[PDB]
């Protein structure tokens, strides 16, 4: 495989990622869409898909230290290491299942399980920009896209 | 040293790496050799 | 990165020869499939095996399952697109799928004075090809012979393959590295369409 | 006081600031929303709530050698040196009367009166990401903000 | 001529800009609006003035090595070096004809043929913010703009 | 699992002096083709297999030679070639030894 997908945050060379601490509350995949709620705890989002103001918050991989993957699940109850995206970077994301990028530039939508997909820019808020042309048939696959 | 519930094993870890291929760059292995070197810019 | 200086392990050296490697990989891959979108007036590439500037010629026979007398037979047909159709000479150079270059060490069959193999009998009928070797980029029954040097197949080096350090500012800028590359190919060609290199099938 | 507020811009200790200098029209208080007008003057910016396209500009606290702090108003007909925000920056903002912030998360809307407020995120245009847990009663407290 | 316009990109001192490269499909002028297709191909956008979720990309000015300036139109079937514009950037803009900007501030909307426009920011999807006082009449004059 | 099966084609016991380094090597390329190891490598083989590799040639003639002095003469990349009695028909074993 030429195109090695084992770090979630690859967006430059130069460019260093904002870090959002917090606590677990369910066990996620690296590279699903976040949402903060009461307490100090992050988890999975479970908002509709049509509902703008969202921040961009995906799930870093965990530390080499720690057990921690683009496919190992976090463990539930602890700190989570998460990621802001600023505008302007690319991130690994996670998709759902049978949508296929075919031109480099559709508008990356929000599911409301937790991952991302492709959807109409006109009824619900565009987080990203695809980046790599290729097509998804199980859910949770990782595919590059830039945050603009 | 080591937490006494896991003191049945023993850690050499030292990585070994991992090899390439049977003839995996022999042709440009021989073109980069030979090359003639230009200035960057000139596209 | 911290935490692994003090366990020893090294975690850098283990990957400043991860990527010195893959950057290798994907200059060859440029060279044997080529790339579309690469172009300034007219100069793409293509590929070493998509290209207008390298003669196709189909072969006949499978040299997976063929004998030794039809391998001979159908080596010739193809350095004939060089001497014949395309007038290039010089010593030529063959390169062998890794599967073809297992079937060229069994028993040759023909002589009898001894024991010899198949490469050892091609490499003293036809003294054309200078060097025979394999390369894993051809999977199956394809073969590609040409010549190599600044009459034929060549290569000119942009920018030499250096490497340096991103340098950190803060107390917790995290360790980054970058290492680059810049080179190009071409099979030379002449004003009617006579080519130098051969793909084969 | 552990969260000492005496600097309207506290974004990170490598983020440097975009300056948008100008002259006044009235006197207003550091850390309120603002808007260009004719001529080449700042004043509040007395926009309707639902109304998008505003860039995000607010009034940088003035120098220390003029007199100026985090609750001294500026003196009108002068140059008020202002902040323009870059998406992923912290702010300390400007809040409105009667609303508690209760999670880290929820969407910044703009008042009309050049305060914020907490809005839904569907009919306004969401400026920024809140980023502290108090309850606020008198207009005019200062809230820490992310401004993404 | 005081204010030289011979560069697209005059955004600061220190902020380096974000590259698409790709191929062309006709030969479009420098500062106007982009949108990349099937294959890898970019051209000009041709989508309607009231859609969302369209990337800021603007086609940078050639190197000066290959023929490039600020009116040279490229040429068709070519690689293309194209910027993508971070929010907080100024970049010369290429707008239509027939509308006068007069305060520093107001929203700037995207045309259909590729340049931009004065509109209500209501119904459109908002990509910059003026920044100089000029009146235009003719098609395809710079005018300089803030991306935020 | 931690070792490659690979099955043979021809019985190594009646075969001739040619099949016999034709399906020595489609054993050694699952080492060097589709696994990538290097290094010399080493046969064992049972006795009745060298039993076999004792009789005369006949491909060769200008003396008399043995199917043994055929692979040592072809493939010399196998460092050591003897017999072990653990095997006991048509089957061998190639492999790398050492700590590698």
């Given at each position: 495989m030429a195109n090695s997908k084992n770090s979630i945050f690859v967006g430059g060379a130069g460019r260093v990622k904002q870090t959002i601490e917090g606590?677990?509350?369910?066990?996620?995949?690296?590279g699903q869409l976040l949402a903060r709620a009461a307490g100090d705890a992050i988890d999975v989002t479970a908002?509709?898909?049509?509902?703008?103001?969202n921040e961009f918050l995906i799930c870093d991989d965990q530390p080499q230290t720690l057990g921690g993957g683009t496919d190992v699940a976090v463990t539930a109850g602890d700190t989570v290491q998460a990621i802001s995206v600023l505008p302007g970077q690319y991130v690994l994301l996670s998709f759902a299942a049978t949508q296929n990028v075919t031109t480099k530039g559709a508008a990356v939508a929000s599911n409301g399980d937790?991952?991302?997909?492709?959807?109409?820019?006109?009824?619900?808020q565009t987080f990203a920009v695809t980046e790599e042309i290729i097509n998804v048939t199980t859910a949770g696959?990782?595919?590059?896209?830039?945050?603009? | 040293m080591?937490?006494?519930?896991?003191?049945?094993?023993?850690?050499?870890?030292t990585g070994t790496g991992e090899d390439r291929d049977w003839g995996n760059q022999t042709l440009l292995g021989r073109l980069?050799?030979?090359?003639?070197?230009?200035?960057?810019?000139?596209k | 990165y911290e935490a692994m200086r003090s366990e020893m392990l090294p975690a850098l050296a283990e990957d400043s020869e991860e990527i010195e490697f893959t950057l290798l990989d994907d200059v060859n891959d440029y060279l044997w499939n080529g790339d579309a979108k690469l172009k300034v007036d007219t100069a793409v590439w293509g590929g070493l095996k998509a290209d207008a500037s390298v003669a196709a010629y189909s072969l006949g026979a499978d040299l997976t399952t063929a004998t030794e007398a039809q391998v001979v037979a159908e080596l010739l047909a193809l350095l004939d697109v060089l001497r014949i159709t395309n007038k290039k000479s010089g010593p030529f150079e063959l390169y062998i799928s890794p599967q073809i270059m297992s079937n060229w060490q069994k028993l040759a069959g023909a002589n009898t004075n001894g024991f010899?193999?198949?490469?050892?009998?091609v490499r003293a009928l036809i003294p054309e090809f200078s060097v025979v070797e394999a390369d894993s980029a051809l999977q199956g029954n394809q073969v590609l012979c040409s010549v190599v040097g600044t009459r034929g197949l060549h290569a000119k080096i942009g920018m030499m393959m250096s490497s340096y350090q991103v340098p950190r500012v803060m107390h917790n800028d995290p360790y980054q590295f970058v290492k680059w590359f810049a080179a190009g190919f071409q099979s030379n060609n002449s004003f009617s369409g006579l080519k130098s290199t051969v793909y084969g099938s």
């Open positions: 606590l677990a509350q369910s066990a996620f995949k690296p908002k509709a898909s049509t509902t703008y103001g937790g991952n991302f997909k492709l959807g109409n820019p006109a009824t619900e696959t990782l595919v590059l896209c830039r945050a603009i | 080591q937490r006494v519930d896991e003191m049945y094993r023993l850690v050499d870890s980069l050799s030979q090359a003639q070197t230009v200035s960057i810019g000139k | 010899m193999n198949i490469m050892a009998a």
